[PDB]
């Protein structure tokens, strides 16, 4: 997320035993990084 110039990153790692779809459980995500970059971001792409 980008809020008032703050780029906030949240994440959680959890095991699974299925490759069909996403598990129907419930899990909260903790904050990990908060970078005060202040950049106008409108587009993105991933790198594999």
């Amino acid at each position, epitope marked *: 997320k980008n809020i008032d110039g703050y780029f906030k990153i949240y994440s959680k790692h*959890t*095991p699974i*035993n*299925l490759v069909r779809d996403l*598990p*129907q*459980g*419930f899990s909260a995500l903790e904050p990990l990084v908060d970078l005060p970059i202040g950049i106008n971001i409108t587009r993105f792409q991933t790198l594999l």
Partner: antibody
Amino acid sequence: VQLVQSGAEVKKPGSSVKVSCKTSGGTFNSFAINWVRQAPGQGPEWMGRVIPVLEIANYAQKFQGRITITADKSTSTAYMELSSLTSEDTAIYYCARHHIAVAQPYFDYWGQGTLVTVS
Amino acid sequence: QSVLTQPPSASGTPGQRVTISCSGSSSNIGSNTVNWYQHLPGTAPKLLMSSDDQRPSGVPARFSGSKSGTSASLAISGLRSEDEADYYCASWDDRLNGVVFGGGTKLTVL
């Protein structure tokens, strides 16, 4: 409301059985239907559920493609199909409803149950 | 077998309190909530406690629950004769991706 299901069924091993659970009119949309069985001398165990508005289904892992759950919107009835019946398949089957806007399920209202015996 | 461990039987005297414990593991009890049910043979079950601290709409002031670590307990005060029934504890299991139920207990009142 109330959920009314089919009566007791008696059937032979190796075949399939079909069980219905008729419900009210307003109990679709933001409401899911869950199936729970209770073997004699055993606790309840969950089989699966279906959300009629999204026509998506979930199945228990230890049922490896043995259970099928379907429903029709026009009549507002849900169907249960179980094949490859064996001697150990004897149990009592329940139909129960769930509210969809809650993270972990909590079954709130239950049917009176139907008994299936195999001999 | 039930992933949640529960004593098979419990007994109590009229007018006093009795506590029923339901023990699980970190994967299910340590991560999810517990639910309590009543069952009378020949009828349909009911709700006693939801979300581990939230009382349902109908049940009278009497049934009480608490949770601690990987175990949970249900406390009944002002016991009366109509309380004779079967109690169940249930919870979600993240490792199994399904609902797991306990074995149930039978309460007897002298």
